Amino acid sequence: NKFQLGFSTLSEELDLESLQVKGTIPKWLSGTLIRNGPAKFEVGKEKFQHWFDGLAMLHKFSFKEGKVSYANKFLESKAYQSARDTDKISYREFATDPCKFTDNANVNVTKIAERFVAMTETPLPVEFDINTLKTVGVFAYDDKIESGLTTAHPHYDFVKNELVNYATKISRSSNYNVYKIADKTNHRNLIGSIPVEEPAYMHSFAMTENYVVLVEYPFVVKPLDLLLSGKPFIENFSWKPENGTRFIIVNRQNGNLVGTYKSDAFFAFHHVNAFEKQEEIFVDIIAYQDSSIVNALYLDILRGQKTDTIPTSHIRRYRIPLSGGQVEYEMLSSEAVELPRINYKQYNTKDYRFVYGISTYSASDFANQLVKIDILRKSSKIWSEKDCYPGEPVFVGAPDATKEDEGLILSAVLDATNAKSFLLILDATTFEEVARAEVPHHIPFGFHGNYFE
């Protein structure tokens, strides 16, 4: 297919002070954008089976007075170092086993204890230096919380200055362990433990003012299958729609169980935003009908001539009545959307109007548009370019902004005909280009990135 290059290895690592810039990047952009994703899809004659298995590479876009610098290095995880030095896959990935959890932290990046960390879904992040992109090593937590599975989608409370996440202890007495990390510590405080027979794959979760909401899609594993089966991690998970989806609501200041509520079965990788209003919670999710999208992101499908087989996801607003009752939803947009982002700093946990994402609607091609959904005016704005495949749109608010959509969108875009990627900068209000920075190579299709001031 045309986008095949986005799922092919990038072996080139370089450090460049200036990229060729078209347009003008506002003077006030003084921070660094870090992109994480897979960038090596084979090790000698052995191939990684899934998109999620590729060995983590970081991309650094640092903004100084209208100019932009770029650096990219592979994360020197034990997974990477072992593959490089033995030419054997040596750690168990999401969907590939070799012929000890992987530290292939290829999903996201954040800061814990004032240190930059790469994250996957195994228990421990991997610390890296933002200046050099060199790997420091395993970032240990300083606590007794047991876990075998977690998210690379921590929430952050700006008022209390706390990271919030959960970790699942997978055993014959499995538990969802909801925790927080105060600034300037790597000690996790256990907020609450919810016991569970068959843990669900919950890639992300919802946070409100007072709550963590775990949305437990009925895509679940038998602990003993995970311990004993010869099969890669994700193959041990089963779709059981007869369970329905369970919404688990935990007070995230005192760990009190607010309640559990059930809707009809659905699956999701990514939450958009959630908020309390009266005695109700609204949870906005990028929802699929079932878990089949997981099998659709195997590389042989992504690289193949049947990509219209890849199921679409849409923004569903679930309404949880705390007073009690079945959880119903409505669609916020008819657009197929993935990789959702918001004005997180100002609107996470709050009523809001604007979602940014990639279009998966297949009007003209696979994942070829950026979209901005106006939830209020049930409308959308679109960016696209012949033979271009744009990555996750990262919002950056402007200084002393008075509006939710006053700022910039940053997206790593693959130009398939040019066989090279560019950073695209849109004004968030108009959703039109203000600048782009050329990169001398292709940036493989990634997952998540964050802007650090």
Known binding positions: 153, 203, 270, 448
CB 181 within 8 A of CB 145: no
**Structure tokens belonging to residue 98:** 């070799």
CA-CA-CA-CA dihedral for 226, 231, 235, 238, to nearest 10: -50
Bridge pairing between strands 354-359 and 369-374: antiparallel
Q: How many of the other CB atoms lie within 10 Å of CB of 258?
A: 17
- Three-state secondary-structure class, residue 328: strand
Bridge pairing between strands 155-157 and 175-182: unpaired
CB 452 within 8 A of CB 34: yes
CB 420 within 8 A of CB 442: yes
Query: Cα–Cα distance between 33 and 38 in angstroms, integer?
Result: 17
C-alpha neighbours within 13 Å on the C-beta side of residue 75? 33
- Three-state secondary-structure class, residue 165: strand
Nearest alpha carbon to residue 370 among 421, 416, 426, 419: 426
Give the annotated binding-site residues for Fe(2+): 153, 203, 270, 448
CB 107 within 8 A of CB 53: no
